[PDB]
Amino acid sequence: NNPEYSSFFGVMGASSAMVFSAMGAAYGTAKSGTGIAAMSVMRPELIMKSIIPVVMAGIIAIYGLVVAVLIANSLTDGITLYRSFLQLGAGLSVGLSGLAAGFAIGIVGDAGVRGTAQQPRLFVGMILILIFAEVLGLYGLIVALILSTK
Amino acid sequence: AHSFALPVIIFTTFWGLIGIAGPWFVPKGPNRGVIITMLVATAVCCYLFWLIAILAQLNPLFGPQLKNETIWYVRFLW
Amino acid sequence: TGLELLYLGIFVAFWACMIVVGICYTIFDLGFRFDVAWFLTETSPFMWSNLGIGLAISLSVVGAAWGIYITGSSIIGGGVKAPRIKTKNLVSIIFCEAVAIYGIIMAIVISNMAEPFSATDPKAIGHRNYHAGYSMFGAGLTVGLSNLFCGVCVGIVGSGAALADAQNPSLFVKILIVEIFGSAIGLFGVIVAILQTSRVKMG
Amino acid sequence: LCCGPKLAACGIVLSAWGVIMLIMLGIFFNVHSLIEDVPFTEKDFENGPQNIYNLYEQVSYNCFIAAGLYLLLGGFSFCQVRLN
Amino acid sequence: VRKMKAIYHTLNLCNIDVTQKCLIAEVWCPVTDLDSIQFALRRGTEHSGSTVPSILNRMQTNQTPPTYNKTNKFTHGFQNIVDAYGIGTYREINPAPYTVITFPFLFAVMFGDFGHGILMTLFAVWMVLRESRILSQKNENEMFSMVFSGRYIILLMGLFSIYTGLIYNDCFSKSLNIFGSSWSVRPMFTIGNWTEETLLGSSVLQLNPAIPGVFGGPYPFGIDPIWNIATNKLTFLNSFKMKMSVI
Amino acid sequence: YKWTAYDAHSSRNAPSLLIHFINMFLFSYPESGNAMLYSGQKGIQCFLI
Amino acid sequence: ELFRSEEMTLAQLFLQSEAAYCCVSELEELGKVQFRDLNPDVNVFQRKFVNEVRRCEEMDRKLRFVEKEIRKANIPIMDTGENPEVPFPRDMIDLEANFEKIENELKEINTNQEALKRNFLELTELKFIL
């Protein structure tokens, strides 16, 4: 009674949630590392502070891990399709959301690292702007979670 | 088996007295204003947090969906 | 322009092939072999619904996220000489999250309508389910894209606001009016998405 | 071996965490012989309440073995940080 | 010498009189401090051989002053996270006295984890136990200094996190069994036309019905532990927390 | 109110606070098809907005 | 009753520079008074405290120089107290010079020591050369 291929959409959800999130976090990490390497030469005392954008990106990667695992542990053979599309939506929703988050993380962090070194008063603002992007990424996680019971 | 009325009385009195009478029973040092703020703010936030948790579970529309092994176990556990 | 050349070549070949196949089906007088109704009916409404839901949430955050770093970089750069900027110009980012929130609320309210059908043969089955499916798809798309472009607008405008305020603190308040319009544009998309799903039923 | 007193201290903390948590786990199953209900049950679970009591005792045994290993680890790390 | 320099620096920040080789200086100080200062001034002038009366004249006119917030070893950290956002308006309501509790509470809701709440406090305690050793030492590691300065904030954050985790009954995903779980009476479940359901159960879960006439009664404190092992906790408990956050 | 007013006895088609809140703002007051939390709620919903 | 910021007055005080010296000493250790700049258009040369600050800067640098050499030598000097007494006599200038002499002496000794060290090595070679 189960439409064939019904399990195909579900499996893709778990994969996408992880892959797109890794892409975002990796982008943010790559951007931050570039700014950190350039900044840290003149002000090595800021090396520890400069990691924050990267930790935030790492959170995005976790966001994705949570959905990918939640879906994976929710896969079966006799999937009724309805459930499968919910899982695919959850994967795609958090994936793109984390991807965009990671980009905002990376771009802002790069500028933030340089700005803070030149003007330490900008440190709090740097965290704030990255914080909003992390909150946006969380939404991506939550909606993926909501679908799991619909 | 439990009623809701008793839990509410016990914990409402606890946090209520702390937030209302508490300020009367406080050291007179330079931190008195902070301790009074603590007593009142704590009682209000803590009470409301708990009250929702216990109130929200009254008149439930459904029970838990349990795995087979647990369902059997409970027969001889609770 | 290696990537732009790739994108163009794919775009042109993609549509050029569609033109040849479409016209050929006509030329060889095929019995409407390419049947749009067939595609729409065999394609499960569940995909359309869940796609629109994912779009509503996913596109909206992309917009916000786009604008955030647009204004973030401008603020961080300018703020080196005008640290006052962070005091007021953060509201540009609040508008960006607010655009995401518009879509987020709709994404949840729409998904709350998702139900199973227990349906099989589309023949005389789910007549209403197809309407609701397509409507949910549209409403999700409607708000998603609308918030996407709003978030870009707000970012561009907020960038100018930060650059302006760095040089003249009196300009901040007046400029705020532009971002408000940007937010209103996104709300317009919300109004339509609400109407589109105002009378739907699933299952 | 020295290994560094900073890392010996970390081992001592993990060892204390291990002994405390693992013994607690065995106790909870031993008392409620329970909500967690994670003793590694069989799939072909029959109508035998005694099977839950028996598996719970197995969990306690296994947990105390793990604690015993943390006792050995903590002992070794203890001497390292003290001598360092 | 560093103090000497400090003094001369301050002495530069003055106006030199023409009538007498005297300086006039302006300070912004509350009355409490002004009384203490007058006494301090007598002490100072007495150390100087000239014992000059050194008149300080109060100014009726008020000039937009800096914001002075008295803090202590515990509340200083909370004031700083307020100041990080901005310096409040003169005579503005200071949010910090409310932050001391409000912020830990919001964290405890965000971090409502009983088990980690304990670990979190223990971390803070470690720092406090070395308080005397950390203060009277060199601390070039700014991240360590920051968390040390916030050590009393962290401790409180853990304290409330335990409170909220306890009501949620989650300690590393572990429930807290107070022997009060009476949500349902399984013995009556089987009586309600469920005979040997554990045979079919091998392929099913089966959700416990509401109001069967034999179930009911709240959990004495917090969420009934039974939901911690349910497959639908994700609707029962998720909904409650949704409504709680809004409220 | 919802927590204290309705039991499982009305769990089927139980009133949804999300829908009533939305209908409140929009002044949408269907005559039937959706159970209200309490009699006269429509009047209160309109009044407050 | 809500917590609010403390008052900062606009008061002005007027007194002799000697009494001012002592008072600044007292107020700085007290730590409770926030001063305003009475001459925003006047530079340090214009304030006429530049001689005192310069003296401070020079002795400061000299002390730091010596301190750096002292630190290089790994000396135990606990630097335990007496700091709270904080006197500021004008005789500090003479104290500074005596400390200046130490710097010069120490530099001279190291310079000479290196020179002697070099001579030693050359003579050491000679020992082998013979």
mmCIF file of N, CA and C in Angstrom, chain E residues 1 3-5 7-8 10-15 21-31 33 40-41 43-45 47-48 50-59 61-63 65-69 89-94 97, chain G residues 2-28 30 32-40 42-44 47-50 52-53 56-57 59-60 63 83 86-88 92:
data_model
loop_
_atom_site.group_PDB
_atom_site.id
_atom_site.type_symbol
_atom_site.label_atom_id
_atom_site.label_comp_id
_atom_site.label_asym_id
_atom_site.label_seq_id
_atom_site.Cartn_x
_atom_site.Cartn_y
_atom_site.Cartn_z
ATOM 1 N N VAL E 1 56.056 56.488 41.683
ATOM 2 C CA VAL E 1 56.321 57.413 40.595
ATOM 3 C C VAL E 1 55.143 57.443 39.661
ATOM 4 N N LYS E 3 52.242 57.039 40.449
ATOM 5 C CA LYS E 3 51.211 57.842 41.088
ATOM 6 C C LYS E 3 51.573 59.306 40.951
ATOM 7 N N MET E 4 52.863 59.609 41.069
ATOM 8 C CA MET E 4 53.293 60.990 40.944
ATOM 9 C C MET E 4 52.833 61.513 39.600
ATOM 10 N N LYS E 5 53.052 60.704 38.566
ATOM 11 C CA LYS E 5 52.742 61.150 37.221
ATOM 12 C C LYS E 5 51.255 61.380 37.141
ATOM 13 N N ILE E 7 49.299 62.275 39.387
ATOM 14 C CA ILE E 7 48.952 63.493 40.086
ATOM 15 C C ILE E 7 49.254 64.662 39.190
ATOM 16 N N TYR E 8 50.406 64.629 38.530
ATOM 17 C CA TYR E 8 50.757 65.796 37.750
ATOM 18 C C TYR E 8 49.812 65.894 36.571
ATOM 19 N N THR E 10 46.690 65.036 36.536
ATOM 20 C CA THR E 10 45.456 65.614 37.040
ATOM 21 C C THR E 10 45.639 67.104 37.230
ATOM 22 N N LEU E 11 46.798 67.489 37.750
ATOM 23 C CA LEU E 11 47.076 68.884 38.021
ATOM 24 C C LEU E 11 47.124 69.688 36.738
ATOM 25 N N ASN E 12 47.466 69.044 35.625
ATOM 26 C CA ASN E 12 47.412 69.757 34.361
ATOM 27 C C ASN E 12 45.972 70.054 33.982
ATOM 28 N N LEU E 13 45.054 69.169 34.360
ATOM 29 C CA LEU E 13 43.642 69.292 34.009
ATOM 30 C C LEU E 13 42.995 70.266 34.994
ATOM 31 N N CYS E 14 43.339 71.538 34.833
ATOM 32 C CA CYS E 14 42.842 72.574 35.725
ATOM 33 C C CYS E 14 42.950 73.911 35.017
ATOM 34 N N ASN E 15 42.453 74.954 35.675
ATOM 35 C CA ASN E 15 42.691 76.335 35.277
ATOM 36 C C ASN E 15 43.530 77.076 36.306
ATOM 37 N N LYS E 21 48.620 82.431 42.893
ATOM 38 C CA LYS E 21 49.104 81.234 42.222
ATOM 39 C C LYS E 21 48.277 80.082 42.763
ATOM 40 N N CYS E 22 47.023 80.069 42.354
ATOM 41 C CA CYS E 22 46.033 79.112 42.791
ATOM 42 C C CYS E 22 45.389 78.504 41.560
ATOM 43 N N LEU E 23 44.872 77.300 41.716
ATOM 44 C CA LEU E 23 44.126 76.641 40.661
ATOM 45 C C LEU E 23 42.681 76.470 41.104
ATOM 46 N N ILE E 24 41.769 76.541 40.140
ATOM 47 C CA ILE E 24 40.383 76.176 40.376
ATOM 48 C C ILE E 24 40.081 74.971 39.503
ATOM 49 N N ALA E 25 39.409 73.996 40.092
ATOM 50 C CA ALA E 25 39.083 72.735 39.453
ATOM 51 C C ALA E 25 37.629 72.380 39.703
ATOM 52 N N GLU E 26 37.014 71.696 38.752
ATOM 53 C CA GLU E 26 35.616 71.326 38.892
ATOM 54 C C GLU E 26 35.542 69.809 38.969
ATOM 55 N N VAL E 27 34.691 69.302 39.853
ATOM 56 C CA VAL E 27 34.484 67.866 39.957
ATOM 57 C C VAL E 27 32.988 67.630 39.985
ATOM 58 N N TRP E 28 32.588 66.481 39.488
ATOM 59 C CA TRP E 28 31.209 66.040 39.607
ATOM 60 C C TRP E 28 31.110 64.965 40.673
ATOM 61 N N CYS E 29 30.450 65.271 41.779
ATOM 62 C CA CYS E 29 30.418 64.262 42.818
ATOM 63 C C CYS E 29 29.079 64.343 43.525
ATOM 64 N N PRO E 30 28.554 63.219 43.995
ATOM 65 C CA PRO E 30 27.318 63.237 44.779
ATOM 66 C C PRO E 30 27.573 63.838 46.148
ATOM 67 N N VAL E 31 26.486 64.180 46.846
ATOM 68 C CA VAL E 31 26.669 64.830 48.137
ATOM 69 C C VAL E 31 27.442 63.906 49.065
ATOM 70 N N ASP E 33 29.680 61.910 48.538
ATOM 71 C CA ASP E 33 31.081 61.964 48.246
ATOM 72 C C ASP E 33 31.549 63.359 48.593
ATOM 73 N N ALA E 40 38.216 64.862 53.380
ATOM 74 C CA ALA E 40 39.447 64.487 52.718
ATOM 75 C C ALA E 40 40.271 65.721 52.441
ATOM 76 N N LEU E 41 39.610 66.808 52.059
ATOM 77 C CA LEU E 41 40.312 68.039 51.768
ATOM 78 C C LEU E 41 40.966 68.562 53.022
ATOM 79 N N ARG E 43 42.089 66.778 55.423
ATOM 80 C CA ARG E 43 43.228 65.886 55.619
ATOM 81 C C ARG E 43 44.372 66.250 54.680
ATOM 82 N N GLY E 44 44.031 66.511 53.414
ATOM 83 C CA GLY E 44 45.040 66.821 52.420
ATOM 84 C C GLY E 44 45.739 68.111 52.763
ATOM 85 N N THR E 45 44.954 69.140 53.086
ATOM 86 C CA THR E 45 45.554 70.446 53.258
ATOM 87 C C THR E 45 46.399 70.378 54.508
ATOM 88 N N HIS E 47 48.109 67.803 55.366
ATOM 89 C CA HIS E 47 49.421 67.238 55.105
ATOM 90 C C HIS E 47 50.325 68.309 54.510
ATOM 91 N N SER E 48 49.775 69.174 53.649
ATOM 92 C CA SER E 48 50.562 70.263 53.084
ATOM 93 C C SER E 48 50.896 71.260 54.181
ATOM 94 N N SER E 50 50.949 74.426 54.174
ATOM 95 C CA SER E 50 50.165 75.664 54.167
ATOM 96 C C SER E 50 48.739 75.589 54.700
ATOM 97 N N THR E 51 48.182 74.404 54.905
ATOM 98 C CA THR E 51 46.809 74.234 55.382
ATOM 99 C C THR E 51 45.896 75.307 54.782
ATOM 100 N N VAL E 52 45.855 75.349 53.453
ATOM 101 C CA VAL E 52 44.987 76.338 52.800
ATOM 102 C C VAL E 52 43.534 75.891 52.912
ATOM 103 N N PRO E 53 42.604 76.773 53.300
ATOM 104 C CA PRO E 53 41.207 76.324 53.447
ATOM 105 C C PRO E 53 40.642 75.576 52.247
ATOM 106 N N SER E 54 41.008 75.962 51.020
ATOM 107 C CA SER E 54 40.635 75.239 49.804
ATOM 108 C C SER E 54 39.108 75.203 49.675
ATOM 109 N N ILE E 55 38.503 76.356 49.399
ATOM 110 C CA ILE E 55 37.045 76.368 49.321
ATOM 111 C C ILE E 55 36.538 75.656 48.071
ATOM 112 N N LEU E 56 35.576 74.746 48.272
ATOM 113 C CA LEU E 56 34.796 74.121 47.207
ATOM 114 C C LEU E 56 33.381 74.698 47.204
ATOM 115 N N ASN E 57 33.000 75.333 46.109
ATOM 116 C CA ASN E 57 31.732 76.037 45.984
ATOM 117 C C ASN E 57 30.777 75.163 45.180
ATOM 118 N N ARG E 58 29.629 74.825 45.763
ATOM 119 C CA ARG E 58 28.643 74.040 45.030
ATOM 120 C C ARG E 58 28.091 74.852 43.866
ATOM 121 N N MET E 59 27.857 74.185 42.732
ATOM 122 C CA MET E 59 27.263 74.881 41.559
ATOM 123 C C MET E 59 25.780 74.520 41.442
ATOM 124 N N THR E 61 23.798 75.309 38.991
ATOM 125 C CA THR E 61 23.585 74.865 37.587
ATOM 126 C C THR E 61 24.011 73.400 37.455
ATOM 127 N N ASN E 62 23.237 72.599 36.717
ATOM 128 C CA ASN E 62 23.542 71.151 36.570
ATOM 129 C C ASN E 62 24.008 70.876 35.137
ATOM 130 N N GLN E 63 25.151 70.202 34.983
ATOM 131 C CA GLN E 63 25.696 69.892 33.634
ATOM 132 C C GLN E 63 25.583 68.384 33.389
ATOM 133 N N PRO E 65 25.916 64.898 33.477
ATOM 134 C CA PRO E 65 26.961 64.207 34.218
ATOM 135 C C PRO E 65 27.199 62.824 33.644
ATOM 136 N N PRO E 66 28.335 62.202 33.943
ATOM 137 C CA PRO E 66 28.468 60.774 33.672
ATOM 138 C C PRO E 66 27.589 59.957 34.596
ATOM 139 N N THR E 67 27.324 58.727 34.179
ATOM 140 C CA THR E 67 26.505 57.812 34.953
ATOM 141 C C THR E 67 27.356 56.985 35.903
ATOM 142 N N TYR E 68 27.086 57.154 37.195
ATOM 143 C CA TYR E 68 27.852 56.490 38.246
ATOM 144 C C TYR E 68 26.964 55.414 38.844
ATOM 145 N N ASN E 69 27.378 54.161 38.717
ATOM 146 C CA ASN E 69 26.647 53.034 39.277
ATOM 147 C C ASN E 69 27.567 52.326 40.257
ATOM 148 N N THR E 89 21.082 56.700 30.629
ATOM 149 C CA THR E 89 20.822 58.109 30.854
ATOM 150 C C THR E 89 20.963 58.437 32.336
ATOM 151 N N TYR E 90 21.479 59.629 32.618
ATOM 152 C CA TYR E 90 21.545 60.097 33.995
ATOM 153 C C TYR E 90 20.179 60.032 34.654
ATOM 154 N N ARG E 91 20.141 59.432 35.841
ATOM 155 C CA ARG E 91 18.908 59.216 36.593
ATOM 156 C C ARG E 91 17.957 58.281 35.866
ATOM 157 N N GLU E 92 18.465 57.508 34.916
ATOM 158 C CA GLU E 92 17.668 56.455 34.322
ATOM 159 C C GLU E 92 17.523 55.300 35.296
ATOM 160 N N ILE E 93 16.466 54.522 35.100
ATOM 161 C CA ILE E 93 16.270 53.313 35.887
ATOM 162 C C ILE E 93 17.374 52.334 35.519
ATOM 163 N N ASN E 94 18.137 51.905 36.499
ATOM 164 C CA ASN E 94 19.207 50.965 36.225
ATOM 165 C C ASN E 94 18.623 49.578 36.032
ATOM 166 N N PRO E 97 19.952 45.745 38.607
ATOM 167 C CA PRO E 97 19.333 45.026 39.727
ATOM 168 C C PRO E 97 18.314 44.000 39.293
ATOM 169 N N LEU G 2 13.530 52.579 43.152
ATOM 170 C CA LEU G 2 14.407 51.983 42.165
ATOM 171 C C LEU G 2 15.817 52.548 42.297
ATOM 172 N N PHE G 3 16.793 51.725 41.919
ATOM 173 C CA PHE G 3 18.187 52.149 41.900
ATOM 174 C C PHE G 3 18.413 53.088 40.724
ATOM 175 N N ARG G 4 19.045 54.219 40.997
ATOM 176 C CA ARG G 4 19.346 55.238 40.015
ATOM 177 C C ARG G 4 20.804 55.642 40.175
ATOM 178 N N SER G 5 21.318 56.371 39.197
ATOM 179 C CA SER G 5 22.710 56.760 39.228
ATOM 180 C C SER G 5 22.926 57.812 40.307
ATOM 181 N N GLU G 6 24.173 57.967 40.724
ATOM 182 C CA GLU G 6 24.523 58.976 41.707
ATOM 183 C C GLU G 6 24.690 60.333 41.045
ATOM 184 N N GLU G 7 24.506 61.379 41.842
ATOM 185 C CA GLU G 7 24.808 62.730 41.407
ATOM 186 C C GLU G 7 26.308 62.959 41.320
ATOM 187 N N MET G 8 26.624 63.741 40.285
ATOM 188 C CA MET G 8 27.913 64.405 39.992
ATOM 189 C C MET G 8 27.655 65.919 39.942
ATOM 190 N N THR G 9 28.235 66.695 40.868
ATOM 191 C CA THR G 9 27.987 68.165 40.965
ATOM 192 C C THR G 9 28.755 68.963 39.901
ATOM 193 N N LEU G 10 28.407 70.244 39.740
ATOM 194 C CA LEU G 10 29.162 71.190 38.872
ATOM 195 C C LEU G 10 30.080 72.074 39.726
ATOM 196 N N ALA G 11 30.209 71.786 41.027
ATOM 197 C CA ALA G 11 31.006 72.629 41.956
ATOM 198 C C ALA G 11 32.400 72.980 41.410
ATOM 199 N N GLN G 12 32.914 74.168 41.765
ATOM 200 C CA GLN G 12 34.321 74.491 41.559
ATOM 201 C C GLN G 12 35.035 74.731 42.879
ATOM 202 N N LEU G 13 36.297 74.336 42.951
ATOM 203 C CA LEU G 13 37.098 74.530 44.142
ATOM 204 C C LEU G 13 38.284 75.373 43.719
ATOM 205 N N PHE G 14 38.749 76.202 44.641
ATOM 206 C CA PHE G 14 39.842 77.126 44.379
ATOM 207 C C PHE G 14 40.839 77.197 45.521
ATOM 208 N N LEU G 15 42.123 76.996 45.220
ATOM 209 C CA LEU G 15 43.106 76.980 46.301
ATOM 210 C C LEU G 15 44.520 76.999 45.735
ATOM 211 N N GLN G 16 45.480 77.200 46.638
ATOM 212 C CA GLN G 16 46.873 77.359 46.255
ATOM 213 C C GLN G 16 47.426 76.092 45.629
ATOM 214 N N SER G 17 48.412 76.283 44.757
ATOM 215 C CA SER G 17 48.964 75.148 44.040
ATOM 216 C C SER G 17 49.616 74.156 44.993
ATOM 217 N N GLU G 18 50.171 74.627 46.115
ATOM 218 C CA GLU G 18 50.769 73.693 47.068
ATOM 219 C C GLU G 18 49.683 72.895 47.759
ATOM 220 N N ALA G 19 48.624 73.591 48.167
ATOM 221 C CA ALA G 19 47.506 72.892 48.755
ATOM 222 C C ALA G 19 46.903 71.999 47.699
ATOM 223 N N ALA G 20 46.894 72.470 46.454
ATOM 224 C CA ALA G 20 46.376 71.628 45.388
ATOM 225 C C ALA G 20 47.218 70.369 45.230
ATOM 226 N N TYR G 21 48.549 70.481 45.315
ATOM 227 C CA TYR G 21 49.392 69.292 45.206
ATOM 228 C C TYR G 21 48.973 68.263 46.238
ATOM 229 N N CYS G 22 48.833 68.728 47.480
ATOM 230 C CA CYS G 22 48.527 67.788 48.549
ATOM 231 C C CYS G 22 47.146 67.203 48.322
ATOM 232 N N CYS G 23 46.211 68.059 47.907
ATOM 233 C CA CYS G 23 44.835 67.627 47.778
ATOM 234 C C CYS G 23 44.744 66.603 46.677
ATOM 235 N N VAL G 24 45.444 66.845 45.568
ATOM 236 C CA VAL G 24 45.377 65.894 44.475
ATOM 237 C C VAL G 24 45.872 64.569 44.993
ATOM 238 N N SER G 25 46.922 64.606 45.820
ATOM 239 C CA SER G 25 47.442 63.362 46.361
ATOM 240 C C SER G 25 46.328 62.645 47.112
ATOM 241 N N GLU G 26 45.621 63.414 47.940
ATOM 242 C CA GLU G 26 44.614 62.843 48.819
ATOM 243 C C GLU G 26 43.413 62.362 48.023
ATOM 244 N N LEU G 27 43.010 63.130 47.015
ATOM 245 C CA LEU G 27 41.799 62.821 46.275
ATOM 246 C C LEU G 27 42.046 61.632 45.371
ATOM 247 N N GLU G 28 43.271 61.518 44.850
ATOM 248 C CA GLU G 28 43.593 60.422 43.954
ATOM 249 C C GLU G 28 43.589 59.126 44.734
ATOM 250 N N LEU G 30 41.878 58.699 47.475
ATOM 251 C CA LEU G 30 40.462 58.532 47.813
ATOM 252 C C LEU G 30 39.673 57.902 46.673
ATOM 253 N N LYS G 32 37.350 59.184 44.577
ATOM 254 C CA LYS G 32 35.879 59.412 44.567
ATOM 255 C C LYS G 32 35.520 60.715 43.840
ATOM 256 N N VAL G 33 36.498 61.405 43.245
ATOM 257 C CA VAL G 33 36.213 62.731 42.615
ATOM 258 C C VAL G 33 36.543 62.684 41.120
ATOM 259 N N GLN G 34 35.614 63.136 40.273
ATOM 260 C CA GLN G 34 35.849 63.153 38.804
ATOM 261 C C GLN G 34 36.058 64.596 38.331
ATOM 262 N N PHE G 35 37.259 64.893 37.826
ATOM 263 C CA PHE G 35 37.704 66.235 37.482
ATOM 264 C C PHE G 35 37.291 66.590 36.056
ATOM 265 N N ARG G 36 37.050 67.873 35.813
ATOM 266 C CA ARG G 36 36.785 68.374 34.470
ATOM 267 C C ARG G 36 38.007 69.154 33.999
ATOM 268 N N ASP G 37 38.275 69.113 32.692
ATOM 269 C CA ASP G 37 39.321 69.941 32.097
ATOM 270 C C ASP G 37 38.870 71.389 31.919
ATOM 271 N N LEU G 38 39.526 72.289 32.644
ATOM 272 C CA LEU G 38 39.240 73.719 32.652
ATOM 273 C C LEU G 38 39.807 74.496 31.467
ATOM 274 N N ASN G 39 40.704 73.910 30.680
ATOM 275 C CA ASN G 39 41.330 74.597 29.550
ATOM 276 C C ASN G 39 41.416 73.699 28.332
ATOM 277 N N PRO G 40 40.298 73.484 27.638
ATOM 278 C CA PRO G 40 40.312 72.556 26.496
ATOM 279 C C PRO G 40 41.213 73.016 25.364
ATOM 280 N N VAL G 42 44.196 74.368 25.690
ATOM 281 C CA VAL G 42 45.573 74.423 26.169
ATOM 282 C C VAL G 42 46.207 73.035 26.185
ATOM 283 N N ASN G 43 47.403 72.956 25.606
ATOM 284 C CA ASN G 43 48.225 71.782 25.357
ATOM 285 C C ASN G 43 49.136 71.593 26.567
ATOM 286 N N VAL G 44 49.977 70.553 26.565
ATOM 287 C CA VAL G 44 50.691 70.265 27.806
ATOM 288 C C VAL G 44 51.749 71.328 27.981
ATOM 289 N N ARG G 47 49.811 74.048 29.562
ATOM 290 C CA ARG G 47 49.463 73.853 30.969
ATOM 291 C C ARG G 47 50.629 74.178 31.890
ATOM 292 N N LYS G 48 51.858 73.976 31.429
ATOM 293 C CA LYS G 48 53.076 74.177 32.216
ATOM 294 C C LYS G 48 53.294 73.098 33.257
ATOM 295 N N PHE G 49 52.831 71.896 32.976
ATOM 296 C CA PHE G 49 53.148 70.766 33.817
ATOM 297 C C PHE G 49 54.088 69.861 33.054
ATOM 298 N N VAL G 50 54.529 70.330 31.886
ATOM 299 C CA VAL G 50 55.315 69.509 30.985
ATOM 300 C C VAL G 50 56.657 69.192 31.602
ATOM 301 N N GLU G 52 57.276 68.627 34.692
ATOM 302 C CA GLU G 52 57.082 67.621 35.715
ATOM 303 C C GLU G 52 56.760 66.297 35.062
ATOM 304 N N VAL G 53 55.966 66.345 33.997
ATOM 305 C CA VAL G 53 55.641 65.099 33.334
ATOM 306 C C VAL G 53 56.876 64.590 32.628
ATOM 307 N N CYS G 56 58.998 62.835 34.893
ATOM 308 C CA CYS G 56 58.367 61.577 35.250
ATOM 309 C C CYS G 56 58.597 60.544 34.171
ATOM 310 N N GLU G 57 58.478 60.963 32.922
ATOM 311 C CA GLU G 57 58.583 60.045 31.801
ATOM 312 C C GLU G 57 60.005 59.556 31.687
ATOM 313 N N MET G 59 62.306 59.384 34.108
ATOM 314 C CA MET G 59 62.746 58.503 35.169
ATOM 315 C C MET G 59 62.012 57.196 35.011
ATOM 316 N N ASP G 60 60.783 57.275 34.504
ATOM 317 C CA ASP G 60 59.980 56.092 34.291
ATOM 318 C C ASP G 60 60.687 55.175 33.316
ATOM 319 N N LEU G 63 63.764 53.615 34.842
ATOM 320 C CA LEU G 63 63.462 52.575 35.797
ATOM 321 C C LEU G 63 63.046 51.349 35.028
ATOM 322 N N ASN G 83 54.286 50.486 48.958
ATOM 323 C CA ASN G 83 53.724 51.217 47.828
ATOM 324 C C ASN G 83 52.583 52.061 48.335
ATOM 325 N N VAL G 86 52.765 56.087 49.166
ATOM 326 C CA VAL G 86 52.743 57.101 48.116
ATOM 327 C C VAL G 86 53.178 58.524 48.446
ATOM 328 N N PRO G 87 54.335 58.823 49.009
ATOM 329 C CA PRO G 87 54.656 60.245 49.133
ATOM 330 C C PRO G 87 55.133 60.752 47.781
ATOM 331 N N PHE G 88 54.997 62.063 47.572
ATOM 332 C CA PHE G 88 55.546 62.729 46.391
ATOM 333 C C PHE G 88 56.329 63.995 46.709
ATOM 334 N N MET G 92 61.986 63.813 44.879
ATOM 335 C CA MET G 92 61.920 62.631 44.044
ATOM 336 C C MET G 92 62.857 62.810 42.876
#
